[model samples]
Target: AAKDVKFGNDARVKMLRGVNVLADAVKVTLGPKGRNVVLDKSFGAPTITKDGVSVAREIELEDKFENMGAQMVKEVASKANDAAGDGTTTATVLAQAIITEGLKAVAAGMNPMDLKRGIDKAVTAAVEELKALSVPCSDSKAIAQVGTISANSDETVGKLIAEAMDKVGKEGVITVEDGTGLQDELDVVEGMQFDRGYLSPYFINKPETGAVELESPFILLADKKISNIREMLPVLEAVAKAGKPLLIIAEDVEGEALATLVVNTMRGIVKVAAVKAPGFGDRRKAMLQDIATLTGGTVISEEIGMELEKATLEDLGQAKRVVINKDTTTIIDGVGEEAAIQGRVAQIRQQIEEATSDYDREKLQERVAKLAGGVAVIKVGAATEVEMKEKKARVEDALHATRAAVEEGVVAGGGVALIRVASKLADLRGQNEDQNVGIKVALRAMEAPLRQIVLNCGEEPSVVANTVKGGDGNYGYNAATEEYGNMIDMGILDPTKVTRSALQYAASVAGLMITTECMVTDLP
Candidate 1:
């Protein structure tokens, strides 16, 4: 017990210190007027960001015990970000409040398990209330509102995201990427992208330029492993004879074949770039099928009973332009008829709907989204790298927020939703004959978000809480304007999915942390 370990009250106190430190750091960036955090990295330049998840990720505590606690809280924030795309700050704040109150109850001799039960009940009820209060998001204006709130109140980004959502619909894939040149812009491109990149270093023709761009490249997408140069000779000969560049995406190109391609690419005999097909096994097969559909070529794989050793030039796909990077590849204006493409997409959709496994369904969903033909590339640009980094963060938040709103729906923001839920919990706590102490603690914890928002706005939390009482849950204070009004009417709303996810994760994490009673460190 003396060897780097703390037990009972001491361990709990140490853990609480770490959790409180992380929660306080995240809570500052909670409201509309929330301030940004400037993080100075040891390896790279400093970053100034207000995103709660980003901030949480950068924080590191010196004390190992405290670091463990902070990491636990960080896990909650990360889960909130993954689940809802926003509400990370709300999640952190709620988790901190719950743990803080639970600790107080435990110190007063209240059972930890009993407190966990009460908090769990509160979370379930709060989630149900949130869902019931949510409104359907049918119009682009509502989508824009969700984007605006997620983008840190940036109206331009909100409008842009809403417009893109309108063009692509809810199921479309939206991506954010760094821009090469000056201005930031959004374009709905007619192309599909894959995560796999060029295989060989010698294939990079222009090292001086930023990205490798090939115009009107012939695509040779293979499903079978190519370990011998004899299997690739015909395609190479055809590409050289036609005096055109080629992009080869294969499952495996080993030994002599890979070396030959590299030598040819360097000698300028045949301009070619090669990359491994995306995914593994079944996923790889599905991606090849998708590529074939978009490129109007057959997928040459042993699984499909294709003889790759006898493959010809006619088996290759044709694309107007192909962009190859070290980690991704994109095909623009691939040779495929619109009707055929739609038919292929429909087939994939039907397969996805019939899929039983969650893993299989998710893989198919990615392919279907890509085949659905709606893609938006948000090219983020700024005068400085730091500015671009900040803009990208905001844009990503806006994108995910809009997606969440579309998937679930919208609810009142500005801490109004939490306040409403807290009010309901208070009423329920009072009427309960069992009079559980855990319910009382959770009721207090529910007010943490509203109180923190008021504090962030430079106002008294007690005064705001008093003012917010006795009214309908829809009424909320606008800390930015120093006014109270109907949050929905004021266009201050949050995605219901984000709010509900935040509540559930926060409660769960806090309950787990409260039950933790000991800490131990090992020697190397």
Candidate 2:
């Protein structure tokens, strides 16, 4: 296949146009009072949202070159979201600001490489300054304040978030789900949870909850797929005769085997539900064993010469209760020996000590936490499906931001933190004039978030940006209250991780765009 090859200004301009279009759409949803975007889908009702990432996700430019440029900004927004849980809109706005100025300097014959170097230097300084400006968020009120701002100044949502965090210790895992009621609710479930849900909906006993719940259920853990009900007949009969529900956890349950379980569950011949074992490949085997240990049950693995047909009731694990939702499953109060569980936790910790990779350490720690701590679930609810969807996104964003905030503390919000950091980069210079201009462009870009926030509040960006820039650390404008005071005192704050992540991600992508002189796309 041939390609459309564009060089120099032609490629730059088209990409810039794409970035401009996307950034403009996302920037409008930056502040507390930011406007909502109405996105019409091909099938469902249109989505109305103020989420920056949501807006970015829907954009698709007609021109291929332009779409490529737009896709860069979208990636920037998404990376920020993934890294810091919030600040996505700010990341988008900052990328636009940087790319717009970056291209202009390029157009004026500035060296793109030197400019990117300068941009990199300036962003580094800004991040360090952000750390210096951040106020440690320790108290519950501070957490709520950060959450409140993240959720668009919704007091209820913020309060709920704070309570959930407080309930689950810092290392505990927290999750969000849609609720049936019109009120948001928080639940602290003490158990081991995995990201696997019911394999079939016919197993749902709690229609109102749209879940299959079991009391003192027998759990059968298997490491391989099961297509033969003949093998499971022994355990099923034992559980049915014992008058207890059975939970089948396997790599995959298929065809007649799954059909048989669903039929038995639905027809009331036996109470049963099946969910795929958590994790994948090597990790999947480990996780299955983990669940087995937690439940005091033996894993049925052919590799171990374990025959399913020979398995009996003694092979099953028991939990006080089990709840299987659409995307998650929780086993509460497993009957495993407390000392055995402790040994498992200690064993994982030992593995953590010897872990050479950060990824492994994080995974090991999560496993320990699951075995050691409680899980928090926030049931987000609203009156309408649209409103619920929107609110759920906010709750999710707020949740992540708050988690980051609690870990590294927070900085003043409404972009004031970035503004204070902006002052530190004024004296910074690069290798040459182009580099210096790059540094200068980045310094100016710091003001974009705050300026966008003020603009969203229907105020003049210039006046607000200037005033906030002039204020000392933590002394800046609060767009929500339209007041001039210490931002920390005003209860407007942001996570340092969020701010730094947005800046770093924005700078990286924007620098890439600035240096891109040629683009190739499929010829139309």
TM-score of each: 0.70, 0.72
C-alpha lDDT score of every prediction, in listed order: 0.78, 0.84
Error in Å for residue 9 of model 2: 2.7
All models, RMSD in angstroms: 8.1, 7.4
RMSD value for candidate 2: 7.4
Q: Model 1: per-residue lDDT, tens digit, 220-254? A: 87877778887677778888888888888888777
Which TM-score value belongs to model 1? Answer: 0.70
Best by lDDT: 2
Which predicted model would earn the best TM-score?
2
